[PDB]
Ligand binder design. Sequence first.
Ligand code: HEC
Ligand code: HEM
Ligand code: HEM
Ligand SMILES: CC1=C(c2ccc(Oc3ccccc3)cc2)C(=O)C2CCCCC2=N1
Ligand code: FES
Lengths: 109, 240, 48, 59, 68, 372, 80
Amino acid sequence: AFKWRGKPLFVRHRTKKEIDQEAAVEVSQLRDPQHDLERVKKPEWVILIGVCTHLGCVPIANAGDFGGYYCPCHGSHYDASGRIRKGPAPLNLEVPSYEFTSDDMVIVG
Amino acid sequence: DLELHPPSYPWSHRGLLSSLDHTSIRRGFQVYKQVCSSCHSMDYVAYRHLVGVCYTEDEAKALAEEVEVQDGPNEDGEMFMRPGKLSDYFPKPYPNPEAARAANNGALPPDLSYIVRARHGGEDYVFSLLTGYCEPPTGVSLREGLYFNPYFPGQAIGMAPPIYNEVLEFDDGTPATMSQVAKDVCTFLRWAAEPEHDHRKRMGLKMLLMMGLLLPLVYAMKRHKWSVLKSRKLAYRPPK
Amino acid sequence: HLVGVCYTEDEAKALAEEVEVQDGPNEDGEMFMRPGKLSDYFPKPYPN
Amino acid sequence: APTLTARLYSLLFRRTSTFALTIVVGALFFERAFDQGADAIYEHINEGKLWKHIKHKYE
Amino acid sequence: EELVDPLTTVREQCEQLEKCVKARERLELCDERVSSRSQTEEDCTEELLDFLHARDHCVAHKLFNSLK
Amino acid sequence: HPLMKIVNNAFIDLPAPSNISSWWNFGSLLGICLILQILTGLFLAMHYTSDTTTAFSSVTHICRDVNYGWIIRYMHANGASMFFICLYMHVGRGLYYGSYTFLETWNIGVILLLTVMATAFMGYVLPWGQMSFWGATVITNLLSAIPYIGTNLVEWIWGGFSVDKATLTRFFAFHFILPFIIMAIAMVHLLFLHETGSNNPTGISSDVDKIPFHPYYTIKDILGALLLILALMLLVLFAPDLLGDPDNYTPANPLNTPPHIKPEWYFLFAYAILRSIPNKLGGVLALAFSILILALIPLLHTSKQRSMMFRPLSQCLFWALVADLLTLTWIGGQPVEHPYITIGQLASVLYFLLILVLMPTAGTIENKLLKW
Amino acid sequence: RQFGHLTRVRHVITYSLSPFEQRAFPHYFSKGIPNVLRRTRACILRVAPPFVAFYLVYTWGTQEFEKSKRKNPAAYENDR
Ligand code: HEC
Ligand code: HEM
Ligand code: HEM
Ligand SMILES: CC1=C(c2ccc(Oc3ccccc3)cc2)C(=O)C2CCCCC2=N1
Ligand code: FES
């Protein structure tokens, strides 16, 4: 978690088994239908704005049902790619605009 | 994911005109100093605040002097340590919140200045959190760094039981039992959050007395003045 | 502040990067040095 | 016979000049009287718990 | 010498009461349920909290009588 | 002599009606609240600092170290609530007795309400606790629901991409001044009232039976002022943290949201109407219309009788609207789960239905019963 | 709008009495408590039932919230 634009910026390096786990998750099952690839620019490094889409509420990572996170306010559960699974939240976690300067530095916005 | 609301422990300072127990504050400070001071911040209290509440000026000065704290810069252009004073605020255990989460399993031990006012229930919650540690029931398998306390919201607190029978010894010669420690320190953490508490209730008494005096006296003046209209009698007398 | 006055963004960024300045705290709960940036104010010669 | 309350009116507060002198002096005394009383009531309510009760202890 | 806390006396005194032992009955009845099942996602926290709530209400009534 | 004559026609020998109940005392109390908030507030600002580094420390510095700083703070903090209690009495009185028929007085009123809502909202941010920060972050972000420019409007309001030091410092500037705009507006609120005279509980022209404001309503408003003071000082001295949220004693932290997020008690009815509608824009428009519908009340009036005193159906629906608001205030306080979602949904529809549909129909029936 | 320019009133007589000549609290508990009760009986039927209905919906809603918060018997029972 980082203070970026006042908002939490959740950068997440995902384990090799966890990366293609979210790829192994099926696409028509999700409330907001998205494959993991159309959310991430480098499979290992997914980054997300840590703000629940139901109402502004900061989620907690490595928590909830799936491998991603959870929202304390009314119990919206997310997966490791940031995608919404359990309600009452409407949409997937907001992916920012970003690109990689070198192998070690990443820039967001 | 269920609530357990604390009970109504009848504190010394519960009623509308009921003041804090300054000897219990005295012991409650010692419980912070000896036990809670090593992990927990109390940023908004200094040793001068203790003067005339639980300690004398000389006693409070000695306790400030016990600890050593930073001061500067000096003439060389660098910082140095010196024995504490009445004007020094209580030493913070770590330099920042990240050092706390480093030292304690990714968990921030919160500031105890306002903790009573900061949490629902207050002393009843803090007391039930301290004394109410128990074993995790069948099904509840907690992870590393965690302990089971039911009164805590998540049921899995990141704090080791902080107080147990005779963890310290009180200067006045009081039996230092676990619940006696919890009682005294909660009576102190009330005072830390609300030092005005005694004075405010005295103003309360005086306000109730004075309102009790004035409200009828003012109401009497209102009635005395409005009497003219309230007794009046209207007679209609048209001609033919 | 130098950008668009006397230098370009890239030139001004390089000059910031030349010098190294403090940042933190980190996860361990301590400070560390890093190469400067456009947002960094000019390094003060002494601490006080 | 001059009564109880009329005796106050006649000499103490018929004039508005003395009315105020009565209030001021009465308020001056009332402050001392009330504070002292309500302090003592609060201190008896909270016996032994305040600093002044346990001050001799550590001094 | 070893010391004793009034807490542990008053807790055992309060554990006597009907609602306490009745919650304790359901807690034990849950413990064996969760123990006897093969693998479950269930716990007996609720019943412990029912028990503790009934107990600590009574504890608070007379614990502070012993403390000063 | 030109000033005394204004004060005469204002407060000394203004012809008041003879039969005015204690529901008219709230106007003078609202001024006493406004002056109390101003005087307490000024003395708080003498020590308070509007930087995110110092804001919390400064408020605690007031309570702890500034001599009698605590009593000034809680008089401000609870007086803010007493102002709002008084407002909701003052608004309801006019709804009941038909005082909204003084259109301009009423419409200036509607402005006065909105300015105080803004004042108190921005005031709540100032101490920089969790609920203050997160209250602002939630409530302000609502504007982003606007069709085409809301997302810009919010960033402009904040002075950046979130609630931050830019927002806090301007929120202090807006708090310290808007009270004076309120007092200026309030003098025009009074100015139109003298033009129109004052209403009485019967809703019948009391020109036949008037009495001079002084000494009657002077001593009556004085009596009422002590009851307001009593109610304040009961809160200040015995229950200063009652109406207030505990989480605002936790210093603000944008990386950690408290679970039960809400405004203060005086916005919870409007918060509940917002939560009722699932669509964001709809929620904002319903939230807005919940307050602004007050401006349609004088147009929705139907009955040939002005006051509700002689109107059973209207009285019952009015007292329903009060209960329905107290329902919404309760629901707004509770989290958005079953069964509170459905209760909030019905309560919210009932609110607009009482105002728009029923109470006009009640008045129309009430006329037909009396051969009007 | 002043005393003198308010309205046309004719053939009325108002008998009044000095506040020093008369009492401040004349028959307060005697005549008042019945009058207070009468006023309460007049309004109660119009005023109270909505607040009663609030209380019913309040306690019920809180009751039903506590029911839904707590465990349920279909949670993995008769299912090992
Ligand atoms: C470490 C060596 C500790 C000592 C000694 C004490 N506390 Fe503590 N406390 C500690 C941690 C790491 C935490 C965070 C726990 C979490 O999982 O969030 C805490 C928390 C508290 C709390 C807050 C509970 C809450 O509702 O958030 C309180 C009220 C608290 N601690 C009180 C306390 C008292 C009174 C102590 C001694 C008299 C004490 N703590 C010692 C770590 C440690
Ligand atoms: C209608 C008038 C006013 C209302 C309704 C109002 C309301 C509030 C509220 C609700 C708070 C937060 C209280 C808390 O919980 O801590 C607050 C804080 C504050 N207000 Fe006001 N206020 C008013 C007028 C003023 C004025 C006129 C000033 C200055 C001239 C002032 C200065 C402050 C300051 C400094 C604080 C921060 C200190 C604190 O939190 O107590 N206010 N106000
Ligand atoms: C700062 C807030 C307010 C102040 C200081 C204020 C002041 C006053 C005063 C002094 C009066 C005369 C006393 C009385 O009859 O009660 C009055 C009357 C009135 N006010 Fe307000 N007011 C405020 C808010 C409002 C609001 C929010 C409304 C409407 C939305 C409103 C509408 C009225 C009306 C209609 C009357 C006429 C009362 C009557 O029927 O006689 N006012 N106001
Ligand atoms: C003008 C007016 C005021 C009034 C008096 C003083 C005011 O100013 C004050 C503001 C703050 C404190 C004290 C007075 C405002 C309105 C009333 O009460 C009333 C009460 C009922 C009669 C009509 C009426 N008319
Ligand atoms: S706010 Fe995150 S679930 Fe309702």
